[PDB]
Design an enzyme around this catalytic site. Structure first.
Site, PDB file in Angstrom:
ATOM      1  N   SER A   1       0.849  -1.233   0.000  1.00 29.40           N
ATOM      2  CA  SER A   1       0.000   0.000   0.000  1.00 29.40           C
ATOM      3  C   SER A   1       0.869   1.262   0.000  1.00 29.40           C
ATOM      4  O   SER A   1       1.978   1.232   0.512  1.00 29.40           O
ATOM      5  CB  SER A   1      -0.901   0.005   1.243  1.00 29.40           C
ATOM      6  OG  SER A   1      -1.843  -1.059   1.209  1.00 29.40           O
ATOM      7  N   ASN A   2       0.351   2.354  -0.567  1.00 28.45           N
ATOM      8  CA  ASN A   2       0.961   3.685  -0.441  1.00 28.45           C
ATOM      9  C   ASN A   2      -0.030   4.668   0.169  1.00 28.45           C
ATOM     10  O   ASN A   2      -1.243   4.550  -0.043  1.00 28.45           O
ATOM     11  CB  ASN A   2       1.362   4.259  -1.805  1.00 28.45           C
ATOM     12  CG  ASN A   2       2.176   3.300  -2.645  1.00 28.45           C
ATOM     13  OD1 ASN A   2       3.181   2.744  -2.194  1.00 28.45           O
ATOM     14  ND2 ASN A   2       1.766   3.135  -3.897  1.00 28.45           N
ATOM     15  N   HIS A  23      -2.917  -1.344  -1.371  1.00 31.16           N
ATOM     16  CA  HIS A  23      -2.652  -2.477  -2.245  1.00 31.16           C
ATOM     17  C   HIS A  23      -3.223  -3.726  -1.599  1.00 31.16           C
ATOM     18  O   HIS A  23      -2.658  -4.245  -0.636  1.00 31.16           O
ATOM     19  CB  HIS A  23      -1.144  -2.640  -2.505  1.00 31.16           C
ATOM     20  CG  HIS A  23      -0.507  -1.454  -3.167  1.00 31.16           C
ATOM     21  ND1 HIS A  23       0.834  -1.158  -3.028  1.00 31.16           N
ATOM     22  CD2 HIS A  23      -1.022  -0.494  -3.972  1.00 31.16           C
ATOM     23  CE1 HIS A  23       1.115  -0.062  -3.712  1.00 31.16           C
ATOM     24  NE2 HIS A  23       0.008   0.359  -4.297  1.00 31.16           N
ATOM     25  N   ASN A 269       4.545   0.790   3.405  1.00 30.47           N
ATOM     26  CA  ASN A 269       4.732  -0.495   4.114  1.00 30.47           C
ATOM     27  C   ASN A 269       6.079  -0.693   4.792  1.00 30.47           C
ATOM     28  O   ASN A 269       6.376  -1.797   5.257  1.00 30.47           O
ATOM     29  CB  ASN A 269       4.461  -1.705   3.211  1.00 30.47           C
ATOM     30  CG  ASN A 269       3.140  -1.623   2.515  1.00 30.47           C
ATOM     31  OD1 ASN A 269       3.074  -1.737   1.289  1.00 30.47           O
ATOM     32  ND2 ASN A 269       2.073  -1.388   3.280  1.00 30.47           N
TER      33      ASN A 269
END
Ligand SMILES: C=CCNc1ncnc2ccc(Br)cc12
Lengths: 546, 163
Positions: A1-2, A23, A269
């Protein structure tokens, strides 16, 4: 993920901004779903949630936007048990032999004949939790076994936590509501508000051990590889109690990393450490956050975010839609130099051509150079001391970098890696002149839709994970619910998509509509105000009661 | 009863649920979600109830890619009656109401479904849901960062023999 939250000191409008790029899987129990929830006068929130949950998990409201990324904190501990030398179903705590508890479950199994038969299975339990076996690593022999204590098993506050988040007014309110309840299981929280505050919180449910207990309580061989493991034969290695924690044995809120700024915060992450390099987060428990080298996604983001130029919504959108393979920045210049040094080598010709012509992207039209690059990197990762500049803790954003081609053993091994990578690419059935979008797809019925993006491990911000299925790479996870929120005077302006579309059912009108749009990278308004909703020519309404 | 919701859908089938209370809000959510994803929820509920092998046999897998029988053992262990009851008892009135509404809304869609947006119509595993089923799903997600990552390992944990 962002996630990127921008504050008043860096945004083009002097207000808050949030990019949410989680994500997550494209199927199953963690498949995001868009919804807007309103109890007029006291709740008005929009975003996406997971299957079966009656609250928004990532979203926005009048003055606030928030999102989540998977954190690097431990949310359980393993306990190495010292077994009773006379009985491997008993274990020692402070030299006293305790019996394992047995809990049997009964499962019905449909046989080949269509009939049900009953299977009974015994689950062994210690005071810490159930025993676990990883053959060859975590065995259950006559000397030792391993039990697992999961901190979230006692977290009954999770649903209330997101309902509370849904009611949050601004960044300060969000922080209060999360710190008060401590119901977030395993994610960071990043947020921005209209006033221009940018918040990062590593605020989740994390086993607590007082600092002085760690050296004696850790299992040295297991913590090197980052497994949270503790000595289960010593009662002093029980999770520490602190009355300030919302749950017995978890880390109090005040001890977990938080960064409240007016410029930016980001996470991809990695640990809390370099959320914003101007203010590093350090001095936390190893169970919480460690100063480990950041992944290429975070390195990419920070390369775009640092400096003094204002950030526009467009800038954040394009960080996703550029599909830049950031890992190429560290490796490809020197790899192309090796290519020029080895002209007339027949084994390297196709690879070197594809790489030099490649746009360094994971775009639909991106050349086969991406495929060659991926296969090379998988081998480059296995090489020892091949970096020209190894990871430098004092330069954590700019290292590692380059290939040490001046070192003769590295030059041989890297060339061999490229030859082997090229052999693999050419061995597979890849048509001449085929592009990335011809390979990576999402299946919808009998049709395929080309999907842009690439694996996050190659530093593609738009992370997409795919698996080989027949002639194609089938997307399984990555970019999912996208939301980009700004706060103009009229009300929150939200833009994004649900990459895999609202419905998992092939019969639905909404099975592939946003997936077509995701392929073309055409984000859309997420309508929130009554005005925005009423402006939509596709507006439908149903009122129901029972 | 006392369940009511107003639902508006914008482009791409995004629902906007308006209600006067948590039960009404859940009602609208459950109904809207069922319209798009009834089969998905039914499948994931079967998983969280540990009933995959019952409906699908031992050769299949869950959407998490676990074998059906090991998955079932894990979820039957995770979602024992005592654990679900304790979890339920710890829930605030507001959360209980959200979940009650959700189950009722999902079930309403199921009653009325003619297959327009539901490919699994007629399957024995597509069934009315209960608030306990929603707790099973919650707990499944709750442990995704913990014991859930060791589901296979828990199932495989057996004491040594005479070796
Ligand atoms: C992306 C958000 C993660 N959110 C959650 N992660 C694990 N378990 C959960 C259980 C209930 C809810 Br509501 C939310 C959960």
């Amino acid at each position: 993920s962002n996630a990127i939250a921008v504050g008043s000191e860096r945004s083009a409008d002097g207000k808050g901004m949030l990019l949410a790029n989680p994500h997550f899987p494209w199927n199953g129990a963690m498949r995001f779903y868009q919804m807007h929830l309103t109890i007029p006068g006291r709740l008005d929130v929009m975003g996406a949630s997971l299957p079966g949950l009656p609250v928004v998990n990532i979203g926005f409201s009048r003055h606030l936007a928030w999102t989540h990324t998977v954190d690097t904190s431990s949310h359980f501990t393993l306990y190495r048990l010292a077994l009773d030398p006379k009985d491997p179903r008993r274990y020692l705590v402070d030299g006293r032999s305790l019996p394992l508890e047995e809990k049997s479950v009964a499962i019905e199994v449909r046989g080949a004949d269509g009939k049900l038969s009953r299977v009974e299975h015994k689950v062994y339990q210690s005071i810490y939790g159930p025993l676990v076996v990883w053959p060859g690593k975590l065995d259950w022999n006559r000397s030792e076994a391993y039990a697992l204590r999961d901190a979230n098993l006692e977290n009954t506050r999770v649903l209330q936590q997101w309902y509370s988040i849904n009611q949050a007014s601004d960044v300060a309110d969000l922080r209060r509501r999360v710190e008060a309840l401590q119901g977030i299981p395993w994610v960071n929280t990043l947020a921005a508000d209209e006033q221009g505050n940018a918040l990062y919180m590593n605020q989740s449910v994390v086993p607590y051990l007082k600092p002085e207990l760690i050296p004696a309580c850790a299992i040295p061989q297991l913590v090197a590889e980052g497994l949270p493991a503790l000595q289960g034969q010593d009662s002093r290695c029980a999770w520490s109690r602190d009355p300030a924690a919302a749950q017995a044995g978890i880390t109090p809120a005040a001890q977990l990393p938080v960064l409240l700024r007016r410029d930016f915060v980001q996470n991809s992450n990695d640990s809390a450490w370099l959320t914003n390099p101007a203010s590093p987060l350090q001095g936390f428990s190893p169970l919480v956050s460690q100063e480990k080298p950041i992944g290429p996604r975070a390195r990419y983001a920070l390369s775009r975010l640092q400096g003094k130029q204002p950030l526009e919504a467009k800038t954040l959108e394009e960080m996703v839609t550029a599909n830049h393979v950031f890992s190429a920045d560290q490796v490809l210049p020197d790899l192309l130099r090796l290519c020029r040094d080895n002209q007339g080598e027949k084994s390297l010709a196709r690879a070197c051509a594809a790489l030099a012509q490649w746009d360094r992207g994971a775009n639909l039209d991106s050349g086969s150079g991406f495929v060659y690059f991926q296969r090379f990197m998988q081998r480059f990762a296995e090489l020892d001391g091949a970096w020209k500049e190894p990871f430098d803790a004092q330069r954590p954003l700019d290292t590692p970098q380059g290939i040490a081609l001046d070192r003769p053993q590295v030059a041989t091994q890297v060339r061999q890696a490229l030859a082997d990578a090229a052999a693999e690419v050419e061995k597979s059935g890849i048509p001449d002149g085929a592009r990335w979008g011809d390979l990576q797809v999402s299946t919808r019925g009998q049709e395929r839709i080309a999907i842009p993006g690439g694996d996050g491990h190659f530093g593609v911000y738009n992370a997409i994970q795919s698996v080989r299925k027949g002639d194609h790479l089938e997307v399984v996870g990555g970019t999912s619910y996208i939301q980009l929120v700004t706060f103009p005077e009229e009300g929150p302006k939200a833009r994004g998509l649900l990459a895999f579309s609202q419905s998992s059912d092939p019969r639905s009108p909404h099975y592939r509509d946003q997936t077509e749009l995701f392929s073309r990278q055409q984000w859309q308004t997420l309508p929130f105000s009554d005005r925005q909703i009423d402006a939509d020519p596709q507006l439908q309404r149903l009122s129901i009661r029972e | 009863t006392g369940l009511a919701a107003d639902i508006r859908w914008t482009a791409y089938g995004v629902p906007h649920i308006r209600a006067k209370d948590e039960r009404g809000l859940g009602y609208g959510i459950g109904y809207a979600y069922a319209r798009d994803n009834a089969c998905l929820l039914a499948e994931e509920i079967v998983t969280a109830r540990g009933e995959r092998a019952r409906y699908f046999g031992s050769e299949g897998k869950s959407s998490a890619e676990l074998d059906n029988l090991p998955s079932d053992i894990f979820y039957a262990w995770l979602n024992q009656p005592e654990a679900l009851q304790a979890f339920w008892q710890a829930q605030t009135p507001a959360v209980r109401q959200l979940l009650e509404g959700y189950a009722a809304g999902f079930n309403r869609f199921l009653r009325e479904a003619d297959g327009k947006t539901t490919s699994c119509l007629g399957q024995p595993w597509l069934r009315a849901i209960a608030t306990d089923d929603l707790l099973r799903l919650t707990r499944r997600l709750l442990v995704e960062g913990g014991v859930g990552q060791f589901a296979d390992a828990l199932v495989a944990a057996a004491p040594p023999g005479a070796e």
